[PDB]
């Protein structure tokens, strides 16, 4: 006789993963968080003096 | 240099203190102060376990110096055996108060 896991297992796994990745991607890239990554290879140094 | 006036335990001990002191004088141990000595523990000569009810927890230290104690309810009726060493225990119920 199928339990909770047999019946819902696959769907809990799939949408849990889908949901978790989507929302953490959104939070990370879309809402103005400044991660402050290394300038190395990405920033062109500019005259400051 | 001296004189008296100080009561003794025989005169003045009361309640459970008096009870233990009186039983000890008769060589008895109704309050479990002493560790019981083991019999040979066979079917024919089981450890006899007093109880005032129909079951009592036994702890068996199977070999001298084991740090592990084996614990089980001993029930009134036929001798039971320790599930680790097989030594035999039998419950002997009832009383303590007259």
């Amino acid at each position: 006789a199928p339990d909770f896991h047999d019946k819902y297992g696959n769907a809990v796994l799939a949408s849990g993963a889908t949901f978790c990745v989507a929302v953490w991607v959104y939070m990370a890239t879309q809402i103005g968080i400044e991660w402050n990554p290394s300038p190395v290879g990405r920033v062109t140094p500019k005259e400051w003096r | 240099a001296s004189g008296g006036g100080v009561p003794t335990d025989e005169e003045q001990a009361t309640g459970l203190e008096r009870e233990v002191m009186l039983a000890a004088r008769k060589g008895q141990d109704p309050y479990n102060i002493l560790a019981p000595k083991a019999t040979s523990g066979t079917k024919e000569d089981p450890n006899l376990v007093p109880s005032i009810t129909n079951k009592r927890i036994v702890g068996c230290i199977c070999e001298e110096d084991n740090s592990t104690v084996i614990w089980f309810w001993l029930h009134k009726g036929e001798a039971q055996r320790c599930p680790s060493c097989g030594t035999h225990y039998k419950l002997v119920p009832h009383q303590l108060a007259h």
């Binding site: - | 009561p7 003045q12 009361t14 309640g15």
Partner: protein, 58 residues
């Protein structure tokens, strides 16, 4: 003095179901209520003091 221990023993072993702290009779009950009233009263007063001291008295 005479030894009246046996009397006290008879009184504190009387089978009346009373807890030891109340087993001496009516005076125990009084002393108990005084103690507990001062403790609970003093504690509410300390909470009051905390409320008052929690704010600037500029």
């Amino acid at each position: 003095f005479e030894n009246r221990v046996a009397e006290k023993q008879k009184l504190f072993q009387e089978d009346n179901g009373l807890p030891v702290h109340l087993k001496g009779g009516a005076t125990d009950n009084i002393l108990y209520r005084v103690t507990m009233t001062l403790c609970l009263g003093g504690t509410l007063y300390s909470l009051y003091c905390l409320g008052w001291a929690s704010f600037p008295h500029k």
